[PDB]
Design a protein around this ligand. Structure first.
Ligand code: HAS
Ligand code: HEM
Ligand code: CUA
Ligand SMILES: [Cu+]
Lengths: 166, 33, 557
């Protein structure tokens, strides 16, 4: 007891510090791992991509929502989306299964969120800005979109739909 | 007096809850990738 | 002038009492909402009722704005001040520059009230984040920016007390509690810049009428500079309490002065440069920066784990002191019949699942699995709603005697417990509800009871949420009768009120000396603090000012 106890403790905390570091690094390893296979698709495009929320919905690829799927590789589709006070455009978002879909998303009003229920597509939609993320829809069917950022009063209502085609 | 077994148990449970959560989520991340 | 003359001898008890009552009313007001928010996630619309009861609430969203702003900005601000001033003061038996201190308390109360007004009015429902472009009443932002500047006062006040205690003690190591609060308030200062930049540069012009727009990518990268560390500024006053008072309420001694300085030191180094973890799903922010703050945030979890051992080992050693004897002997020996003690130690328990929450969250790519979902409030209730908060609750059953002279009647004491256990078992219940529902993609900041057929699979968590709602309703209520009966009480027997704070003695080592000396390089590390901020928020802030794109605000409630 008393100062016999102080050594033990200081040495133990060392053992602790050590194991926390290892375990944390395994994590930084593991995190990084994901960061180099496909599934880092969902990480936003880090390049600044300025637009103008006032004219986003009148001019550009978000102005006409028949014109929001845009084939772009032998197996690629860009989707222009619009997240606006209290729905998403297009509704629905019809993309092919198997394909590399490239969502490009922006807002005429305030920030909303674009959470494609059942995936790690989880991007914040910022007025002034295009958020870009990749996804590869593997199994076909129906994916709901939930806005998961408070964008005012129709918030709890703000959903849309992705139909990955069979 | 001796070895502080109590505290170790406490970082054990800790350390495992940490693993339970991190491994568990990792899993899901993939499940949905 | 006085018949409780107190306040010409130890008047700092006056400022502290006041502050803390503020906090707690803030907390009693804000929290009123929470049980409602709870049944909401329960899928039960209690807002018919609430609405009637207090008739000025317009929306769920105003509710969640009050609960947010008053509980987590305001209540944790007034506790941190109260504690990380009144303690370093007393450990130095020194008088805080009381001119300033009441400036401090006034700024707060003005700030609060200036701000509280638009909010009860429904004119600033923009959440405790007030993420632009959603556009709040000007009296919100100036309101909040003052009340936060209210802590620059307190930064100085404390540095005052440090400056002069060292004039009285050349070649003498900063005593622990005073040391903690210095590296604290420095830390807060670096960290406070972000919101303060955002409030001056953008929020105020824009809301005063003096510009049309804020770029919302900066607006929120400035916001998160501060808005991370702030959780560390809520948490550290409870660590002070936990590290250097708790183990004495526990029966025991803290087992390492150095260790607790070490951890605090680390919250000045790694608390501020880490808030892109909050932006893992932002656009226009470079994946490598995000990965670095991901790394930094892992390091910051480290001090807190070291805390796990130092604190658990202390409580263990006490356990054996009061004749504990199994591998868990030491536990039931602790004084489970004390609210001063039961509170932070229950809080500490749901910190274990709470941290494991943060560490996930902080792992970049893993964030895309839970970001903006019920998962988050899950994590963050475990942290501040239980840990910081319950620490605050338990510390009534010592700070209140110390400051009022009012004593705790054995049936007020049996109440504390009931509350502290009722509260804790609530959080835990609610934790499971949120995290769970979180993982079923249930978003957050949402009136989901209004779209009742929408989360089919959240059926079963929603029950936990309901129940927790009833529990913490009961819990919160018991706490009001209790609080206003330990205060609506003329019986003050202040032999226990002069009585000095139950500080805990250290188990010193030989190492103590050479190492505590290096961590007391305070000025130096506080520069490494700003070096680490500059390098981290540095080539990102470069950029986003090279490319501002402000955008009209909207009001959407
Ligand atoms: C006061 C508050 C908080 C502290 C605590 C806190 C700690 C962490 N958090 Fe957090 N957090 C995040 C990562 C962390 C990490 C790594 C930590 C670390 O500090 C955790 C380290 C802690 C531990 C590793 C626990 C150690 C356990 C101990 C020390 C207890 C031992 C027990 C004993 C000794 C008892 C023994 C006794 C007996 C009787 C047996 C991330 C991601 O990076 C997000 C954003 C996610 C998103 O997508 O929105 C986030 C979001 C939040 C926000 C939501 C803000 C918003 O509204 O957007 C608040 C509410 C919050 C508060 C707090 N958070 N956090
Ligand atoms: C009776 C006690 C409480 C209950 C039942 C409760 C419950 C909740 C629920 C159900 C939500 C979120 C629902 C949604 O995301 O819209 C929430 C949000 C939140 N709570 Fe609590 N809470 C309580 C106390 C506290 C305490 C003590 C704190 C810290 C002081 C706190 C801080 C917060 C914050 C900062 C948010 C987020 C607001 C935002 O999204 O901007 N709560 N609470
Ligand atoms: Cu869009 Cu909430
Ligand atoms: Cu954070």
């Amino acid at each position: 007891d008393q100062h016999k106890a102080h050594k033990a403790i200081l040495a133990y905390e060392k053992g602790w510090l050590a194991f926390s570091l290892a375990m944390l690094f395994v994590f930084i390893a593991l995190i990084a791992y994901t960061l180099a296979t496909h599934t880092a698709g969902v990480i936003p495009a880090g390049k600044l991509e300025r637009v103008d929320p006032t004219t986003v919905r009148q001019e550009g690829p978000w102005a006409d929502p028949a014109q929001a799927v845009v084939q772009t590789g032998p197996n690629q589709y860009t989707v222009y989306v619009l997240a606006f006070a209290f729905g998403y455009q297009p509704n629905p978002i019809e993309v092919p299964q198997g394909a590399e879909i490239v969502f490009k998303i922006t807002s005429p009003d305030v920030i909303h969120g674009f959470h494609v229920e059942g995936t790690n597509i989880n991007v914040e939609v910022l007025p002034g800005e295009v958020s870009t993320v990749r996804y590869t829809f593997k199994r076909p069917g129906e994916y709901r979109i939930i806005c998961n950022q408070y964008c005012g009063l129709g918030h709890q209502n703000m959903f849309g739909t992705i139909v990955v085609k069979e | 007096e001796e070895k502080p077994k109590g505290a170790l148990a406490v970082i054990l449970v800790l350390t495992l809850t940490i693993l339970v959560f991190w491994l568990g989520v990792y899993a899901v991340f993939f499940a949905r990738g | 002038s006085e018949i409780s003359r107190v306040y010409e001898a130890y008047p700092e008890k006056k400022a502290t009492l006041y502050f803390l009552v503020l906090g707690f009313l803030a907390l009693i007001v804000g929290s009123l909402f929470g049980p409602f928010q709870a049944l909401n996630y329960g899928n039960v619309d209690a807002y018919p009722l609430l609405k009637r009861l207090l008739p000025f609430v317009q929306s769920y969203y105003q509710g969640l704005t009050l609960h947010g702003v008053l509980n987590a900005i305001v209540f944790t601000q007034l506790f941190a001040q109260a504690i990380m001033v009144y303690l370093p003061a007393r450990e130095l038996n020194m008088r805080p520059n009381m001119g300033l201190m009441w400036l401090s308390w006034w700024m707060a109360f003005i700030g609060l009230v200036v701000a509280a007004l638009p909010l009860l009015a429904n004119e600033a429902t923009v959440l405790y984040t007030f993420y632009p472009p959603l556009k709040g009443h000007w009296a919100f932002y100036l309101g909040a920016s003052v009340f936060v500047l209210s802590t620059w006062v307190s930064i100085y006040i404390v540095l005052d007390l440090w400056r002069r205690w060292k004039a009285a003690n050349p070649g003498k190591v900063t005593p622990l509690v005073t040391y903690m609060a210095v590296v604290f308030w420095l830390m807060w200062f670096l960290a406070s810049l972000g919101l303060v930049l955002e409030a001056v540069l953008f929020l105020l012009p824009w809301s005063f009428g003096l510009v049309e727009g804020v770029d919302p990518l900066v607006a929120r990268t400035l916001f998160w500079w501060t808005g991370h560390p702030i959780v560390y500024f809520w948490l550290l006053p409870a660590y002070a309490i936990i590290y250097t008072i708790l183990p004495k309420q526990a029966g025991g001694r803290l087992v390492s002065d150095p260790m607790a300085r070490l951890a605090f030191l680390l919250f000045l180094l790694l608390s501020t440069p880490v808030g892109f973890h909050h932006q893992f799903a932002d656009p226009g922010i470079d994946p490598t920066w995000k990965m670095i703050h991901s790394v930094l945030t892992l390091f910051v979890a480290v001090p807190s784990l070291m805390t796990a051992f130092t604190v658990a080992a202390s409580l263990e050693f006490a356990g054996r002191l009061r004749g504990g004897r199994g591998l868990f002997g030491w536990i039931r020996a602790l004084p489970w019949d004390n609210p001063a003690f039961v509170a932070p130690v229950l809080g500490l328990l749901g910190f274990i699942p709470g941290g494991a929450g943060g560490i996930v969250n902080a792992s970049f790519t893993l964030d895309y699995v839970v970001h903006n979902t019920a998962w988050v409030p899950g994590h963050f209730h475990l942290q501040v709603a239980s840990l910081v908060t319950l620490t605050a609750m338990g510390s009534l059953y010592w700070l209140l005697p110390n400051l009022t002279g009012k004593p705790i009647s054995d049936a007020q004491r049996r109440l504390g417990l009931a509350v502290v256990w009722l509260w804790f078992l609530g959080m835990m219940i609610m934790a499971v509800g949120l995290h769970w529902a979180g993982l079923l993609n249930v978003p957050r900041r949402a009136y989901i009871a209004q779209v009742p057929d929408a989360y089919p699979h959240a059926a079963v968590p929603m029950v936990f949420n309901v129940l927790a709602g009833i529990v913490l309703l009961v819990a919160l209520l018991l706490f009001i009768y209790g609080l206003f009966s330990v205060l609506l009480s003329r019986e003050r027997k202040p032999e226990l009120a002069e009585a000095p704070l139950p500080f805990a003695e250290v188990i010193s080592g030989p190492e103590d000396r050479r190492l505590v000396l290096a961590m007391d390089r305070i000025g130096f590390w506080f520069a490494v603090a700003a070096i680490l901020v500059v390098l981290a928020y540095g080539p990102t802030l470069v950029q986003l000012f090279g490319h501002l794109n402000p955008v009209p605000g909207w009001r959407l409630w």
